[PDB]
Design an enzyme around this catalytic site. Structure first.
Site, short mmCIF file in Angstrom:
data_model
loop_
_atom_site.label_atom_id
_atom_site.label_comp_id
_atom_site.label_asym_id
_atom_site.label_seq_id
_atom_site.Cartn_x
_atom_site.Cartn_y
_atom_site.Cartn_z
N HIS I 60 0.83 -1.19 0.00
CA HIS I 60 0.00 0.00 0.00
C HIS I 60 0.87 1.25 0.00
N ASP I 90 7.51 21.13 -27.87
CA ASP I 90 7.43 19.82 -27.21
C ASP I 90 8.52 19.76 -26.13
N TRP I 125 7.05 0.12 4.31
CA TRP I 125 7.54 0.80 3.12
C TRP I 125 8.87 1.48 3.36
N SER I 152 13.64 5.98 -13.65
CA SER I 152 12.63 6.78 -14.34
C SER I 152 12.52 8.17 -13.72
N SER I 153 12.55 8.25 -12.40
CA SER I 153 12.42 9.54 -11.73
C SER I 153 13.57 10.47 -12.09
N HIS I 228 12.42 12.39 3.52
CA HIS I 228 11.65 13.61 3.72
C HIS I 228 11.67 14.47 2.46
N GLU I 230 11.41 13.41 -0.31
CA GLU I 230 10.38 12.77 -1.10
C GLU I 230 9.00 13.35 -0.79
N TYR I 232 8.25 16.25 0.10
CA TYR I 232 8.12 17.54 -0.57
C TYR I 232 8.22 17.44 -2.08
N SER I 243 -1.83 27.05 -7.19
CA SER I 243 -1.62 28.44 -7.57
C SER I 243 -2.30 28.76 -8.89
N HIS I 277 14.05 14.18 11.92
CA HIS I 277 12.85 14.21 12.74
C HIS I 277 12.08 12.90 12.64
N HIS I 278 12.46 12.02 11.71
CA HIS I 278 11.96 10.66 11.62
C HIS I 278 12.73 9.69 12.51
N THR I 303 6.16 27.74 4.34
CA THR I 303 4.90 27.07 4.03
C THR I 303 3.71 27.92 4.43
N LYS I 306 2.92 30.78 1.79
CA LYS I 306 2.18 30.33 0.62
C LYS I 306 0.69 30.20 0.92
N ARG I 428 1.09 1.74 15.12
CA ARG I 428 0.93 1.53 13.69
C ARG I 428 1.36 0.11 13.31
C1 HEA Z 1 3.45 15.32 1.46
C2 HEA Z 1 3.40 14.70 2.62
C3 HEA Z 1 3.92 15.40 3.82
C4 HEA Z 1 4.07 16.80 4.16
C5 HEA Z 1 3.81 18.13 3.51
C6 HEA Z 1 4.65 16.77 5.52
C7 HEA Z 1 4.95 17.92 6.20
C8 HEA Z 1 5.49 17.96 7.46
N1 HEA Z 1 5.79 16.86 8.21
FE1 HEA Z 1 5.56 14.96 7.72
N2 HEA Z 1 5.32 13.06 7.23
C9 HEA Z 1 4.82 12.56 6.07
C10 HEA Z 1 4.38 13.29 5.01
C11 HEA Z 1 4.38 14.65 5.00
N3 HEA Z 1 4.82 15.49 5.98
C12 HEA Z 1 4.80 11.08 6.08
C13 HEA Z 1 4.29 10.34 4.87
C14 HEA Z 1 5.36 10.68 7.35
C15 HEA Z 1 5.54 9.30 7.93
C16 HEA Z 1 6.56 8.48 7.16
C17 HEA Z 1 6.76 7.26 8.02
O1 HEA Z 1 7.10 7.48 9.21
O2 HEA Z 1 6.67 6.12 7.54
C18 HEA Z 1 5.63 11.98 7.99
C19 HEA Z 1 6.15 12.01 9.24
C20 HEA Z 1 6.46 13.14 9.91
C21 HEA Z 1 7.01 13.03 11.27
C22 HEA Z 1 7.37 11.78 12.03
C23 HEA Z 1 6.55 11.62 13.30
C24 HEA Z 1 6.96 10.27 13.84
O3 HEA Z 1 7.69 9.56 13.12
O4 HEA Z 1 6.57 9.93 14.97
C25 HEA Z 1 7.18 14.42 11.61
C26 HEA Z 1 7.76 15.00 12.84
O5 HEA Z 1 8.69 15.78 12.74
C27 HEA Z 1 6.74 15.22 10.46
C28 HEA Z 1 6.73 16.58 10.44
C29 HEA Z 1 6.30 17.33 9.39
C30 HEA Z 1 6.34 18.80 9.43
C31 HEA Z 1 6.87 19.47 10.67
C32 HEA Z 1 5.80 19.24 8.17
C33 HEA Z 1 5.58 20.59 7.57
O6 HEA Z 1 5.80 20.58 6.16
C34 HEA Z 1 4.17 21.14 7.82
C35 HEA Z 1 4.18 22.61 7.42
C36 HEA Z 1 2.79 23.18 7.32
C37 HEA Z 1 2.23 23.88 8.32
C38 HEA Z 1 3.01 24.16 9.57
C39 HEA Z 1 0.83 24.43 8.16
C40 HEA Z 1 0.80 25.58 7.16
C41 HEA Z 1 1.57 26.74 7.75
C42 HEA Z 1 0.94 27.65 8.51
C43 HEA Z 1 -0.54 27.56 8.73
C44 HEA Z 1 1.71 28.81 9.10
C45 HEA Z 1 1.39 28.98 10.58
C46 HEA Z 1 1.84 27.72 11.29
C47 HEA Z 1 2.82 27.78 12.21
C48 HEA Z 1 3.48 29.09 12.52
C49 HEA Z 1 3.27 26.53 12.91
N4 HEA Z 1 6.29 14.41 9.46
C1 HEA Z 2 -0.23 8.95 -1.15
C2 HEA Z 2 -0.21 7.73 -0.66
C3 HEA Z 2 -1.41 7.18 0.01
C4 HEA Z 2 -2.82 7.25 -0.27
C5 HEA Z 2 -3.72 7.87 -1.30
C6 HEA Z 2 -3.42 6.47 0.84
C7 HEA Z 2 -4.77 6.29 0.94
C8 HEA Z 2 -5.37 5.59 1.94
N1 HEA Z 2 -4.73 4.96 2.97
FE1 HEA Z 2 -2.80 4.89 3.30
N2 HEA Z 2 -0.86 4.81 3.64
C9 HEA Z 2 0.12 5.38 2.91
C10 HEA Z 2 -0.05 6.11 1.78
C11 HEA Z 2 -1.27 6.38 1.23
N3 HEA Z 2 -2.48 5.98 1.70
C12 HEA Z 2 1.45 5.10 3.48
C13 HEA Z 2 2.66 5.66 2.78
C14 HEA Z 2 1.23 4.31 4.66
C15 HEA Z 2 2.21 3.73 5.64
C16 HEA Z 2 2.71 2.40 5.09
C17 HEA Z 2 3.32 1.61 6.22
O1 HEA Z 2 2.80 1.68 7.35
O2 HEA Z 2 4.33 0.91 5.98
C18 HEA Z 2 -0.24 4.18 4.67
C19 HEA Z 2 -0.83 3.48 5.66
C20 HEA Z 2 -2.17 3.31 5.75
C21 HEA Z 2 -2.71 2.50 6.86
C22 HEA Z 2 -1.98 1.87 8.00
C23 HEA Z 2 -1.91 0.36 7.96
C24 HEA Z 2 -0.85 0.06 8.98
O3 HEA Z 2 0.36 0.19 8.68
O4 HEA Z 2 -1.24 -0.37 10.08
C25 HEA Z 2 -4.12 2.61 6.60
C26 HEA Z 2 -5.29 2.05 7.31
O5 HEA Z 2 -5.56 2.54 8.39
C27 HEA Z 2 -4.30 3.39 5.38
C28 HEA Z 2 -5.53 3.64 4.85
C29 HEA Z 2 -5.71 4.38 3.72
C30 HEA Z 2 -7.06 4.62 3.19
C31 HEA Z 2 -8.23 4.05 3.93
C32 HEA Z 2 -6.83 5.43 2.02
C33 HEA Z 2 -7.68 6.02 0.97
O6 HEA Z 2 -8.36 4.94 0.32
C34 HEA Z 2 -8.72 6.96 1.54
C35 HEA Z 2 -9.80 7.21 0.49
C36 HEA Z 2 -9.31 8.00 -0.70
C37 HEA Z 2 -9.40 7.50 -1.94
C38 HEA Z 2 -9.95 6.11 -2.13
C39 HEA Z 2 -8.91 8.28 -3.14
C40 HEA Z 2 -7.55 7.78 -3.58
C41 HEA Z 2 -7.44 7.88 -5.08
C42 HEA Z 2 -6.24 7.84 -5.68
C43 HEA Z 2 -5.01 7.65 -4.85
C44 HEA Z 2 -6.07 7.93 -7.18
C45 HEA Z 2 -5.71 9.34 -7.62
C46 HEA Z 2 -5.40 9.32 -9.09
C47 HEA Z 2 -5.71 10.36 -9.87
C48 HEA Z 2 -6.41 11.54 -9.26
C49 HEA Z 2 -5.39 10.34 -11.33
N4 HEA Z 2 -3.11 3.80 4.90
O1 PER Z 3 8.06 13.59 6.56
O2 PER Z 3 7.63 14.91 6.97
CU CU Z 4 9.99 13.99 7.33
#
Ligand code: HEA
Ligand code: HEA
Ligand code: PER
Ligand code: CU
Ligand code: CDL
Ligand code: CDL
Ligand code: CDL
Ligand code: CDL
Ligand code: PEE
Ligand code: PEE
Ligand code: K
Ligand code: ZN
Ligand code: ZN
Ligand code: ZN
Lengths: 65, 226, 120, 52, 121, 107, 196, 62, 459
Positions: I60, I90, I125, I152-153, I228, I230, I232, I243, I277-278, I303, I306, I428
């Site tokens: 998943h 193109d 994953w 590919s990426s 991380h 990734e 972003y 935008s 932070h992970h 962030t 924006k 988890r």
């Molecule tokens: C695209 C996906 C995405 C994005 C944008 C982010 C954004 C951020 N993530 Fe991430 N993060 C994940 C995807 C993402 N993350 C995933 C997938 C994991 C788990 C991976 C795994 O463990 O397997 C993860 C895990 C993860 C952890 C791990 C927690 C743990 O392992 O127990 C933490 C903690 O530091 C973290 C922090 C953040 C922070 C601080 C931001 C910042 O970018 C957020 C910034 C945005 C805001 C802050 C809000 C908008 C800003 C404002 C409204 C301004 C005013 C706000 C303030 C002044 C605070 N992320």
């Molecule tokens: C972007 C990536 C992505 C997306 C879309 C989702 C979508 C969803 N995920 Fe996600 N999920 C992950 C990334 C994602 N997840 C990752 C990275 C983990 C951690 C893996 C790990 O633990 O090792 C995770 C883990 C995770 C768990 C934890 C299982 C566990 O480890 O114990 C669960 C269930 O609770 C869950 C549920 C769901 C559900 C219910 C939806 C969605 O079904 C919710 C409903 C939304 C939709 C059905 C729309 C989705 C449609 C598309 C994605 C297609 C878009 C295409 C076009 C627009 C062209 N996810």
């Molecule tokens: O990963 O934030």
């Molecule tokens: Cu991170």
């Protein structure tokens, strides 16, 4: 040529054969099966059943069914 | 232009092996019926025949001299077309910057087709706005909705053809008196004698008029191995 | 009013599912024999021979478009001389009723307004 | 240079193609299998792929 | 206050009512809304007001509902979502009676404060 | 920041006392899905699609100039749906400056 | 000043009339340059030597005619007659008499507009200025209204946040009384279970 | 080369006419099966040229 | 032809098509997870087949990240509009563009084939060793897929960077969004490849990096140094889309264009230096923890800028324009949803809060709100905006208020309860859990089945 102006002209001009759409949906359906079929196969391989009965790994009342 | 790559050897001159072998017909073909290679060698043979005759140059008018060398006397019609051609080519790899367009003097947008995509950025300084893209189709005086800058499409079209240097030369240049082969022979004997060839093009050209292989050393010149 | 009723006549309900008869009743897979349609199938779609098996990009049916003088056919503008001036009349697109169907009447008014910009 | 007419009259008088008939949500459930087992171009391509 | 203190070249309406007009409307029917506040068939143009006569920059405002139902319509003739109502009638009233506006705002805020504090506390 | 074009009071003075702001409708019209005729073949349906382009439409003002369909980005300038080859003639982004040279003028 | 001074294209001459640099593999023939300088004389030295173009004297009357018809061209033609024209002098002459192509706006066909439409140009410009005036003023008006509204959001977010501050405040008071007074807190109570 | 360093070939000495070189309609019937095998082998001259230059050093390493 | 086509716009369509197909497999796996978690007991997976659940969650995550959202937001919309936005005929590298999509498909086939043929086990994953290196051959197959995907990426990133050399217009914000993601890929991917090769060496070449006297924490550093960046690389293209949509639909010029651009650049630099932070709970040094916590909180500044610049784009827009279009609703919903995800990210950024919330479903809900809700909706909104240009039909989405409302409500029913169970606490990557966590798990499960049903109504 006018027919070649648009990419995927038959589809965009709404003349394409429906089989193309069917194949796309079938391909998605097959992709989905890759999560369900191995689940059933693995369950049977290690248990002898394709799917469990809810809470059959825990103690159940006499009248539970 | 900056977008063009490096001059080829052909951009300077063509190999004498590309000279048409039927010179007699080449010098009698009308300009509109001559291809690129035929037109190159018609001008070179005729132009060098007049230039290699010093005693006649001072009495030859610029109108006649330009005709012999194949140069087109310029006029407002042809200048307009050539200028718009070169402006189109320049804009292929260059920015599009100029004065603000008004009804009296619209922004001129050259195009070959009936449409060209154009963007208006407004005026200078604070009067500049974000790019507003529009499709400039012929026959309409366009006005930007934001700054009221007037645009207009100019089409390089003439008689089912677009404008090219070849088209401009064919439409406006007029063939003069038919080239006389006696002049070719006379100049040939002037600069080519006793195994010395100081007009190589006229030695090859005279050989072809004679039938190919007639002049000394020309059979050996035409015998190749691959 | 109901604008659909204006162009109801143009929309004749269909007979075949997906707009084609069974291939047995008519073989739409074959190339059309009509003169000038050798690149099309019977149902109007482009034939595989034209697009795949003998695609011109692969060297089939080599035919250079440009002529000797480096020219290609170009359609001229609609020129109209008047008042001691040569004018070009632009091509106006057909009424949107012809292309879309709805009758172009009772259109809501959206005035011209310059861009909404933040000031100060 | 080729000369073509403005129109051509076909020898047959069969209107084989036209607008789609109104379809429901599950129309595909029967139409798709019908194409596979009844349209030659479909089942000849399937057999060819499987055989080779 | 755009017409009042900022810009003097847009038509300025008269307030017919500082409350919206409730009307039942039907999909597929076009309605014409009075933008001058002088029509006697409010909220619609009556054929005799400024809007109907195209006088002084006043024109009828075309409107059409997507679905059948009861919709609120602007009486103050200045709501941002005109012809529909969004609360601008109350806002424009506060501009005209700022003392009354404070009373209502205090009362509304008082109720909101009590309820949110009572539940969270 | 951009705040519109600058206006001098002299440019706001009318030539007649009845001048008001022109009330021209900038709604292009009523549209829907492009509706192809059954009789039209692939080539003729392509022509139909090319004649239904909103970005080829404009509004003509009282003085004969037309304000075209405009967009912030060039994505809205290609035919819809996008053809295989779009910008054969390079789109021209017009920049404005105050520089001039004598050759362009004649006395 | 391009490509290190190496010309992209240049002329080479060979003394033997039947010489081929690709077929022959001899090691005695020395190539010459366009002016005839043998290759064994380095460029730094040959470029200092002054080379001038010599036309046959039969051309002098023609070169004289050119100078008289175009007096600005006379000094260059005189150099050529007197055998004083180098390659650089020729280049100066060439680029001095090159002129740009001219475009005439009077020859451009115009988009069709009726005489009625042409008389309304001032009116349309007048409308455009009033639209720009109204646009610019509205920008100030809107900026003031909405940025002021954002303050309502700050105050609403400060009220809602303060609600959780009060809950947290009461929470800490309660926690301080747990180990001190709360009967829920029990000591000498939990006994080890022991292994099963 | 047909690039800046050179130019076009005179018609007297052109040997691959594009009119005959292209227009591959039914070329397989004109060349036969052995011709098809020959054409495939001849299409890989560039790859053959490389392998003739690459193999020797690798033999030495081996 | 179909597979031979080099047209950049056709390839863009292929990327979206393949993302939906592979997405079906992704959603199915998600349904399996939520069904299992509906109560305590075994529901659809036997206790003797618990390894399958571990594989389900692993696949998943991997598929949704690398085979669905990344190919959709960085391969699909980019390949279709970027050359148009750049007023160029193109894409710069036509043949490379073709092979990139083919590579993605081939790596997908390898992964799914490994499900069918290999024994089904999982290691997350994040493929943490030593667990990843003591597994069966399915782990080897997954590694091949990732490496192939990496090829590919990177080549696609090279393709987009070359637009700077040919762009004939102005670099719009969206173009800046893709360029910076491309830079992030060029700098992060080579590090990922190295650590993946070391995983292979220990799996297949008897290497000893991840056995005693070798630090397993080493993998986590190199992995998350790509991890991380990734997240972003997956969000920045979404920001670029938001935008364009807001400016176009509201007929308002982007406000603070240069601040938007400089905010994207800033997020990238900061995102390249905050990876640990992970790794808060591993036991890093106090000063390291403080550095990473400090820099992680800084990312909110760019962030935040924006977000507020987007808000003013929607403010003040004309009322006459109909605001119920699905693209506009999705763009607005993104702002509302992204703030939730980001704020929770800042909460978890505090390491002491993180001790309690690491490896809990609070983290799940955090990155779902951003990806499963925010990124998905952004891709949908972008495709919807380009419906006329792309030309697809046979769906009822463009104006469907029911779909938007039902999606928003039900998606929140799934992940909002996952924040609650994070303080319950429910770890988890588990399938069985205590009976006192059923309520919230049940509510989220009801949300998952409902969302799937709403996906059928579009057709
Ligand atoms: C695209 C996906 C995405 C994005 C944008 C982010 C954004 C951020 N993530 Fe991430 N993060 C994940 C995807 C993402 N993350 C995933 C997938 C994991 C788990 C991976 C795994 O463990 O397997 C993860 C895990 C993860 C952890 C791990 C927690 C743990 O392992 O127990 C933490 C903690 O530091 C973290 C922090 C953040 C922070 C601080 C931001 C910042 O970018 C957020 C910034 C945005 C805001 C802050 C809000 C908008 C800003 C404002 C409204 C301004 C005013 C706000 C303030 C002044 C605070 N992320
Ligand atoms: C972007 C990536 C992505 C997306 C879309 C989702 C979508 C969803 N995920 Fe996600 N999920 C992950 C990334 C994602 N997840 C990752 C990275 C983990 C951690 C893996 C790990 O633990 O090792 C995770 C883990 C995770 C768990 C934890 C299982 C566990 O480890 O114990 C669960 C269930 O609770 C869950 C549920 C769901 C559900 C219910 C939806 C969605 O079904 C919710 C409903 C939304 C939709 C059905 C729309 C989705 C449609 C598309 C994605 C297609 C878009 C295409 C076009 C627009 C062209 N996810
Ligand atoms: O990963 O934030
Ligand atoms: Cu991170
Ligand atoms: C997330 C989901 C929800 C999303 C919602 C939101 C969506 C928003 C909108 C998104 C829009 C994106 C952009 C769209 C752009 C579209 C452009 C387009 O149309 O391009 C034209 C393009 C092609 O049109 P064309 O130009 O006319 O092409 C002509 C052909 O090139 C030439 O024509 P031809 O006829 O000559 O064609 C050749 C044809 C010839 O075909 C035939 O002859 C077919 C014969 C019939 C076969 C039928 C299948 C049979 C299956 C049998 C199974 C038996 C099982 C038995 C089990 C027994 C168990 C006991 O095919 C082949 O030969 C090869 C076919 C290969 C592909 C199919 C593969 C199928 C799966 C295979 C799995 C194999 C697994 C093996 C495992 C092995 C392990 C060991 O269109 C398509 O391809 C169709 C696209 C349709 C969808 C478009 C999008 C619509 C909007 C979205 C709808 C929702 C979709 C949801 C996803 C799907 C859910 C399931
Ligand atoms: C006197 C009445 C007020 C009484 C209380 C006052 C308290 C003191 C406040 C400060 C002083 C106020 C002084 C105002 C005087 C008037 C000034 C003026 O110019 O008047 C004319 C001016 C309007 O005049 P106009 O512009 O000419 O046109 C008339 C129209 O009416 C145009 O009207 P408008 O556009 O201004 O309409 C107002 C509308 C404008 O705003 C909107 O409509 C925006 C609505 C956007 C909604 C987007 C969807 C959100 C869905 C999210 C779902 C998330 C689920 C998953 C969560 C997972 C979490 C883990 O406001 C709202 O709808 C309120 C939105 C408030 C924020 C919503 C979010 C609350 C979050 C709560 C915490 C959540 C925590 C968990 C989540 C994660 C946390 C990190 O009137 C106002 O300014 C009225 C403001 C009224 C504010 C009422 C706020 C009530 C709601 C409170 C929050 C909800 C919980 C409460 C418990
Ligand atoms: C003793 C031994 C000694 C040693 C010997 C050593 C020998 C060494 C040999 C070395 C070389 C071997 C390989 C040779 C390759 C030659 C390639 C070549 O030059 O071909 C030219 C050749 C040109 O053909 P042509 O002769 O001119 O005529 C072709 C026809 O007219 C057809 O015309 P067309 O090309 O326009 O039509 C193509 C198209 C026509 O379109 C359609 O069929 C309908 C429209 C599309 C329907 C919707 C499909 C789903 C949406 C996909 C969206 C993304 C597409 C991306 C682009 C396509 C990527 C394939 O359909 C297809 O054929 C494929 C469509 C896409 C299929 C995949 C879609 C996803 C399905 C997922 C299902 C599971 C989940 O290329 C092709 O057309 C065929 C290439 C086939 C390559 C197949 C590779 C498959 C690899 C699969 C994975 C492998 C590992 C696992 C396998 C497990 C199996 C159990
Ligand atoms: C240079 C140059 O000539 O560039 C144009 C030139 C193309 O010529 P052109 O025809 O003038 O281009 C037209 C413009 O593109 C069209 O541009 P325009 O006219 O629309 O706008 C004017 C200006 C618009 O652009 C600008 O003026 C932007 C200038 C600032 C860019 C951001 C700088 C970094 C942020 C600040 C850092 C501060 C650090 C402080 C440290 C303090 C320590 C004490 O144009 C350019 O600057 C175009 C070039 C932009 C190049 C961007 C390269 C990637 C930037 C990556 C930023 C950092 C990412 C960090 C990732 C995470 C790392 C851990 O660019 C190239 O030749 C492209 C080569 C690409 C190679 C990529 C592979 C490299 C390995
Ligand atoms: C019942 C489950 C859902 C089935 C479904 O919606 O399948 C749709 C899908 C595409 O059909 P249409 O959208 O009608 O395309 C043809 C041209 N209009 O239908 C099929 O693929 C039919 C076969 C489905 C097999 C599923 C196993
Ligand atoms: C983007 C390109 C620049 C990246 C620079 C990243 C540097 C971040 C600094 C973090 C820091 O303080 O490093 C500590 C941290 C380790 O901390 P502890 O395991 O607690 O050990 C400390 C004492 N035993 O250092 C690292 O892990 C550094 C990893 C090397 C990064 C190399 C990047 C190379 C880029 C090319
Ligand atoms: K369970
Ligand atoms: Zn402008
Ligand atoms: Zn009225
Ligand atoms: Zn009101």
């Amino acid at each position: 040529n006018l027919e070649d102006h648009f990419d995927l002209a038959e589809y965009m001009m709404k003349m394409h054969n429906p089989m193309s759409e069917y194949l796309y949906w079938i391909a998605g359906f097959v992709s989905g099966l890759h999560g369900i079929l191995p689940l059933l196969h693995s369950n049977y391989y290690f248990s002898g059943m394709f799917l469990p009965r809810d809470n059959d790994n825990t103690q159940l009342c006499d009248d539970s069914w | 232009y900056r977008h063009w790559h490096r001059m080829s050897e052909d951009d300077w001159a063509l190999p004498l092996d590309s000279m048409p072998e039927d010179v007699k017909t080449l010098m009698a073909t009308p300009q509109t019926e001559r291809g690129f290679v035929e037109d190159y060698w018609y001008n070179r043979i005729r132009g060098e025949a007049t230039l290699l005759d010093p005693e006649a140059l001072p009495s030859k008018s610029y109108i006649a001299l330009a005709r012999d060398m194949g140069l087109q006397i310029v006029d407002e019609p042809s200048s307009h077309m050539m200028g718009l051609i070169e402006l189109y080519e320049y804009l292929r790899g260059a920015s599009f910057v100029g004065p603000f367009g008004t009804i009296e003097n619209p922004v001129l947008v050259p195009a070959v087709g009936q449409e060209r995509v154009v963007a208006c950025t407004g005026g200078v300084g604070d009067e500049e706005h974000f790019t507003l893209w529009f499709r400039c189709r012929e026959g309409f005086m366009y006005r930007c909705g934001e700054c009221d800058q007037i645009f207009m499409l100019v089409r390089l079209y003439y008689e089912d053809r677009y404008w090219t240097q070849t088209l401009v030369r064919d439409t406006f240049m007029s063939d003069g008196d038919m080239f006389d082969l006696k002049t070719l022979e006379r100049v040939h004997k002037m600069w080519n004698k006793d195994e010395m060839v100081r007009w190589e093009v006229g030695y090859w050209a005279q050989d072809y008029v004679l039938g190919k292989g007639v002049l000394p050393g020309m059979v050996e010149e035409h015998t190749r191995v691959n | 009013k109901s604008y659909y009723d204006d162009f109801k006549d143009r929309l004749k309900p269909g007979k075949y599912t997906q707009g084609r008869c069974p291939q047995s009743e008519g073989d739409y897979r074959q190339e059309s024999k009509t003169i000038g349609r050798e690149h099309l199938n019977d149902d109007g779609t482009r034939s595989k021979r034209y697009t795949v098996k003998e695609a011109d990009a692969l060297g089939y049916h080599y035919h250079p478009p440009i002529d000797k003088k480096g020219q290609v056919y170009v359609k001229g503008p609609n020129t109209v001389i008047e008042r001691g001036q040569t004018w070009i009349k632009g091509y106006e697109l057909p009424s949107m009723e012809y292309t879309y169907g709805p009758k172009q009447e009772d259109i809501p008014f959206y005035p011209r307004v310059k861009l909404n910009v933040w000031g100060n | 240079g080729r000369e073509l007419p403005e129109y051509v009259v076909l020898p047959h008088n069969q209107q084989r193609y036209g607008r789609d008939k109104s379809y429901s949500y599950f129309t595909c459930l029967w139409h798709f299998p019908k194409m596979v087992f009844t349209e030659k171009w479909c089942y000849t391509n399937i057999m060819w792929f499987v055989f080779w | 206050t755009w017409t009042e203190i900022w810009w003097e070249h847009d038509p300025t309406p008269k307030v017919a009512q500082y409350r919206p007009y409730v009307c039942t409307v039907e999909s597929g029917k076009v309605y014409w809304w009075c933008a001058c506040g002088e029509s006697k068939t409010q909220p619609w143009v009556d054929g005799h007001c400024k809007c109907s006569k195209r006088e002084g920059g006043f024109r009828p405002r075309r409107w059409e509902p997507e679905h059948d139902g009861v919709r609120l319509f602007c009486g103050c003739k200045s709501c941002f979502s005109s012809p529909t109502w969004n609360g601008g009638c109350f806002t424009k009233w506060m501009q005209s009676n700022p003392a009354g506006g404070m009373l209502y705002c205090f009362a509304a805020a008082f109720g909101f404060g009590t309820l949110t504090v009572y539940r969270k506390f | 920041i951009y705040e519109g074009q600058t206006v001098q009071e002299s440019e706001l003075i009318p030539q007649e006392d009845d001048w008001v702001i022109e009330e021209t409708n900038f709604c292009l019209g009523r549209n829907c899905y492009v509706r192809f005729r059954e009789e039209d073949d692939l080539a003729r349906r392509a022509l139909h699609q090319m004649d239904s382009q909103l970005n080829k439409m404009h509004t003509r003002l009282r003085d004969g100039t037309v304000i075209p369909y405009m967009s912030f980005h060039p994505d809205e300038m290609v035919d819809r749906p996008a053809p295989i080859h779009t910008f054969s003639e390079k789109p021209l982004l017009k920049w404005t400056w105050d520089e001039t040279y004598e050759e362009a003028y004649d006395d | 000043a391009y490509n290190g001074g190496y010309p992209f294209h240049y002329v080479v001459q060979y003394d033997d009339p039947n010489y081929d640099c690709e077929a022959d593999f001899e090691f005695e023939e020395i190539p010459r340059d366009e002016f005839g300088v043998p290759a064994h004389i380095p460029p730094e030295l040959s470029t200092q030597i002054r080379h001038t173009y010599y036309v046959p004297p039969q051309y002098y009357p023609f070169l004289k005619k050119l100078g008289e018809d175009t007096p600005e061209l006379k000094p260059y033609t005189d150099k050529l007659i007197m055998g004083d024209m180098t390659y650089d002098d020729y280049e100066e002459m060439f680029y001095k008499f090159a002129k740009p192509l001219k475009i005439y706006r009077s020859r451009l066909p115009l988009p069709y507009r009726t005489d009625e439409e042409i008389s309304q140009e001032k009116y349309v410009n007048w409308c455009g200025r009033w639209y720009s005036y109204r646009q610019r003023l509205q920008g100030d008006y809107y900026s003031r209204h909405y940025f002021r509204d954002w303050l309502i959001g700050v105050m609403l977010g400060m009220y809602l946040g303060n609600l959780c501050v009060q809950q947290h405040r009461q929470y800490r008071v309660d926690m301080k009384l747990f180990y001190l007074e709360a009967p829920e807190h029990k000591i000498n109570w939990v006994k080890p279970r022991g292994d099963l | 080369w047909p690039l800046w360093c050179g130019g076009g070939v005179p018609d007297k000495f052109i040997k691959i006419d594009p009119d005959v070189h292209f227009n591959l309609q039914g070329y397989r019937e004109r060349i036969g099966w052995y011709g098809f095998f020959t054409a495939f082998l001849q299409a890989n001259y560039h790859a053959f040229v490389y392998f003739v230059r690459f193999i020797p050093i690798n033999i030495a390493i081996f | 032809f179909y597979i031979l086509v080099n047209n950049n716009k056709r390839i863009g369509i292929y990327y979206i098509k393949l993302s939906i197909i592979i997405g079906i497999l992704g959603i199915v796996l998600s349904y399996i997870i939520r069904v299992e978690l509906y109560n305590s007991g075994n529901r659809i997976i036997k206790y003797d087949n618990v390894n399958y659940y571990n594989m389900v969650i692993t696949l998943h995550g991997l598929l949704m990240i690398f085979y669905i959202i990344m190919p959709g937001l960085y391969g699909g919309i980019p390949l279709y509009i970027l050359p148009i936005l750049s007023v160029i005929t193109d894409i710069v590298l036509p043949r490379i563009n073709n092979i990139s999509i083919i590579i993605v498909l081939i790596s997908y086939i390898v992964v799914i084939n490994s499900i069918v043929i290999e024994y089904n086990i999982g290691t997350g994953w994040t493929l943490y060793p030593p667990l990843s290196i003591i597994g069966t051959v399915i782990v080897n197959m997954i590694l091949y897929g990732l490496i192939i995907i990496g090829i590919s990426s990177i080549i696609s990133a090279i393709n987009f960077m070359n637009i700077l050399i040919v762009i004939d217009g102005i670099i719009y914000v969206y173009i800046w969004s893709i360029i910076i993601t491309s830079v992030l890929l060029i700098i992060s991917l080579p590090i990922l490849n190295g650590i993946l090769l070391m995983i292979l060496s220990d799996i297949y070449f008897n290497s000893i990096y991840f056995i005693l006297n070798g630090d397993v924490v080493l993998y986590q550093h190199l992995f998350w140094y790509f991890g991380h960046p990734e997240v972003y690389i997956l969000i920045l293209p979404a920001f670029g889309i938001i935008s364009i949509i807001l400016s176009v639909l509201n007929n308002k010029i982007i406000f603070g264009m240069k601040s938007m651009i400089l905010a994207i650049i800033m997020i990238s630099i900061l995102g390249s230096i905050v990876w640990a932070h992970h790794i808060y709970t591993v036991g890093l040094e106090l000063d390291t923890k403080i550095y990473f916590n400090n820099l992680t909180l800084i990312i909110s500044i760019p962030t935040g800028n924006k977000i507020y610049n987007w808000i003013i784009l929607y403010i003040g827009s004309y009322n006459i324009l109909y605001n119920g279009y699905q693209s506009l609703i999705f763009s607005i919903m993104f702002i509302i949803i992204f703030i939730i995800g980001g704020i929770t990210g800042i909460i978890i950024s505090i390491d002491i809060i993180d001790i309690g919330l690491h490896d809990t479903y609070y983290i799940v809900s955090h990155f779902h709100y951003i990806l499963s809700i925010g990124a998905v909706i952004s891709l949908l909104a972008g495709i919807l905006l380009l419906k006329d240009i792309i030309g697809y039909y046979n769906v009822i989405i463009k104006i469907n208020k029911y779909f938007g409302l039902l999606l928003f409500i039900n998606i929140n029913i799934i992940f909002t309860p996952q924040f609650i169970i994070g303080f319950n606490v429910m770890p988890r990557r588990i399938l069985e859990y205590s009976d006192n966590i059923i309520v919230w798990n049940l509510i989220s499960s009801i949300g998952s089945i409902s969302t799937i049903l709403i996906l059928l109504s579009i057709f």
